[PDB]
Amino acid sequence: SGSEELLEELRELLERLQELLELIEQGKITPEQLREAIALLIEVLQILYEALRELAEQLQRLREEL
Amino acid sequence: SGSEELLEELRELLERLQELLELIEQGKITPEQLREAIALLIEVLQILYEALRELAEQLQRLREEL
Amino acid sequence: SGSEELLEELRELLERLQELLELIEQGKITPEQLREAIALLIEVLQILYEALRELAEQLQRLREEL
């Protein structure tokens, strides 16, 4: 579906966020990397919101098919 | 549905987060704005979690209608 | 379902994020706590992404059951 393609981007961005998470856990993240992590969180969330909207549209269209 | 109303709030908060993202991309965000972005990310996520829970409840109720 | 178990972890992590949000709103959060909040946002998002993928798989399997 389309939701899938969106989930692929969630996946890759989250792999970079996983690296930033491990830097936080290690105590090594710089201010520039904290700003990168904030930006990636916003980018991920915008895509996850769109995938949510598409899944809600599918569920309500099928609710309208019964 | 109810999920929709929740998605509207995700939408507006995300428009402010889009502005903060562009400040990060420009290299211009202040510490106060980084703190604002973190707060908005938490607020958005709380709403997206509730919308997720409602959609999972709908899917499992329909799973129970078949 | 499985999505539920995932939503429980979203719930608890979000209760700690709620506390960090209130510190931001009060003007009292430290840099260490800002880093904690960023890490928790990434952890929550990884779980919410997995719960999204599972719900999309369920919807598309049922789409394939009609």
Residue numbers in the entry:
A (entry chain A), B (entry chain A), C (entry chain A): 2 to 67
Structure paper excerpt:
Here, we computationally designed monomeric and homo-oligomeric miniproteins binding with high affinity to the MERS-CoV spike (S) glycoprotein, the main target of neutralizing antibodies and vaccine development. MERS-CoV S comprises an S1 subunit, which mediates binding to sialosides via the N-terminal domain (NTD) and to the dipeptidyl-peptidase 4 entry receptor (DPP4) via the receptor-binding domain (RBD), as well as an S2 subunit which promotes virus and host membrane fusion to initiate infection,12–17. We show that these miniproteins broadly neutralize a panel of MERS-CoV S variants, spanning the known antigenic diversity of this pathogen, by targeting a conserved site in the receptor-binding domain (RBD). The miniproteins directly compete with binding of the DPP4 receptor to MERS-CoV S, thereby blocking viral attachment to the host entry receptor and subsequent membrane fusion.
Based on our previous success in designing a homotrimeric, pan-variant SARS-CoV-2 inhibitor, designated TRI2–224–27, we set out to engineer homotrimeric versions of cb3 to enable simultaneous engagement of all three RBDs within a MERS-CoV S trimer and enhance potency and breadth further through avidity. 12 trimeric cb3 constructs were designed, consisting of 6 oligomerization domains with both N- and C-terminal fusions for each oligomerization domain (denoted with prefix ‘n’ or ‘c’ to describe the position of the miniprotein relative to the trimerization domain). Two of these failed to express (nTrimer3 and nTrimer4). Evaluation of neutralizing activity against the MERS-CoV EMC/2012, Jordan/2012 and United Kingdom/2012 pseudoviruses revealed that trimeric cb3 miniproteins were endowed with at least an order of magnitude greater potency, compared to monomeric cb3, with the exception of cTrimer1, cTrimer3, cTrimer4, cTrimer5 and cTrimer6 fusions which failed to neutralize MERS-CoV United Kingdom/2012 S VSV pseudotypes (full curves for each replicate in Fig S1).
